[PDB]
Write a protein that binds this DNA or RNA. Structure first.
Ligand SMILES: Cn1cc(NC(=O)c2cc(NC(=O)CNC(=N)N)cn2C)cc1C(=O)NCCC(=N)N
Ligand SMILES: Cn1cc(NC(=O)c2cc(NC(=O)CNC(=N)N)cn2C)cc1C(=O)NCCC(=N)N
Lengths: 255, 255
DNA sequence: CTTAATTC
DNA sequence: GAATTAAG
DNA sequence: CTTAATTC
DNA sequence: GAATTAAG
């Protein structure tokens, strides 16, 4: 039972993650940047009610906190399908434009897979849940991502902001990838015979045999949980000779 | 008096031209071409009355003649300005597409003028009137350019066609330029010290002195008239140190 | 909603 | 230019 | 008028 | 795609 053996490693049973070994991130602004405060376009009650549960959960989790900031960006009413299903989506484009660029270090899937040797055909694929949220944001950089929030009655003071790396921020993917690489460096050293591919929050572990993959997967899950990351048990593909990774179906050494 | 000295050379007094030394032109068709007969779109009476005088003049001049041809292209109602002023314009595009291409030998004005030496600053500019019409078309090629014509009453039988190189034909400019070059070859040989630039029907004669330009112009006018070409006396610029040629103003060796 | 490149 | 698409 | 590339 | 331009 992979589930009961690693309670801390799975998002379903280990609680929200927090990368304890990573220092809170400081987000450098471009040399000429000054705060921008964009007005929140009026949100319908339907949208507000749909978003409310998520905001409260994030507040309870400490991922969102009240604040007064010179920065402010819009929250928009999203619902891809059309019937119900709401989720808060922040338009951080004006913030992104004022943040210093960093080199794009995440490899494209095609090149990443070129590092998969035919000798290793036993795989385990894991995707980390709420990955960006596991990385803390330094208090100095938190004001940057503020947005407005309120309830027709006893609504929050005014603004709320993120204490963790947020969705919609241009550097989140790269910063997360680099952080996890730092945290998994030792694991790679302790398991020289295993192949570990990282694409932001999507991991592929490859071994030469089922046994090696089993032992390697136990070690990786143990390490991820200890570091504060959380993998999706529901979507995990453990020790299979056929797996779906980054849109590809890895089979018979193909793809 | 340049006018009375060369009666035959000027269009105003020498009658319609005819290049007597040039064999009637045969127009080769592409290897897969077959005749195309395009219907004449109904012409308003206003247009017909405006065009009629020109058709009659051309018929009287023998430039247009009755015919029965498998080829037929449209005549359109033209009048650039808007009030009156009509002229027959034939849409020969479907004929052009079926005629074999020839190398474009007419130089562009820019390069043509590069052959004008600073040593020759006395000029004479002449433009030949109804130049294309001076070149006969071989009877075998005449049917190619047929079009319909008629009068609400005793109108012409049906079709009319050209016995001379027509306007709107893709190769007329090049064929005329080459023909005149053949006819003026001897003149160039007899006058080595003169510079003669030809751009289809626009000629520029350049000499080192007023006297040389005067003598050269007399010889050129005499030669052109004898060959059957006709220059516009109204637009002629004779022995001037400043002239307008091909859109350029030639002055102080400039342009 | 807003900012914007794609198509037509 | 206006409609269609994309994405924060 | 018809055929067509340019712009918007 | 529709209006604007060009040219036989
Ligand atoms: C890939 N892509 C195709 C499109 N749009 C289309 O393909 C497209 C545009 C149209 N437009 C019309 O039909 C216009 N009709 C009309 N004016 N009568 C029809 N289609 C199928 C937009 C984008 C796109 O990426 N847009 C977002 C660019 C960005 N802001 N980064
Ligand atoms: C050089 N040139 C410019 C144009 N047209 C334009 O410049 C032009 C096109 C438009 N179009 C519009 O305004 C369209 N408006 C709209 N659909 N609401 C405005 N202008 C100024 C056409 C040609 C041209 O050469 N056409 C003939 C090509 C040929 N058939 N050989």
């Amino acid at each position: 039972t992979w589930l009961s053996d690693f309670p801390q490693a799975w998002a379903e049973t280990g609680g929200m993650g927090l990368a304890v070994r990573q220092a809170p991130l400081i987000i450098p602004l471009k040399a000429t940047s000054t705060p921008v405060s964009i007005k929140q376009y009026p949100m319908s009650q339907e949208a507000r009610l749909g978003i409310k549960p998520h905001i409260q959960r994030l507040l309870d989790q400490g991922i969102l906190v009240p604040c007064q900031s010179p920065w402010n960006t819009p929250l928009l009413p999203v619902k891809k399908p059309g019937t119900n299903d709401y989720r808060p989506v922040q338009d951080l484009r004006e913030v992104n434009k004022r943040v210093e660029d960093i080199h794009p270090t995440v490899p494209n899937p095609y090149n990443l897979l070129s590092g998969l040797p035919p000798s290793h055909q036993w795989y385990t694929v894991l995707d980390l849940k709420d990955a960006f949220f596991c990385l803390r944001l330094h208090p100095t950089s938190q004001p940057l991502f503020a947005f407005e929030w309120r309830d027709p009655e006893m609504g929050i003071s005014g603004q709320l902001t993120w204490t963790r790396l947020p969705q919609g921020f241009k550097n989140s993917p790269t910063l997360f990838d680099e952080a996890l690489h730092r945290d998994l460096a030792d694991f790679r050293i302790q398991h020289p015979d295993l192949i570990l591919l990282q694409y932001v929050d999507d991991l592929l572990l490859a071994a030469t045999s089922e046994l090696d993959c089993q032992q390697g997967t136990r070690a990786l899950l143990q390490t991820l949980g200890n570091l504060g990351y959380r993998a999706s048990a529901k979507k995990a593909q453990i020790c299979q000779k056929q797996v779906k990774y980054l849109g590809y179906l890895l089979k018979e050494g193909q793809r």
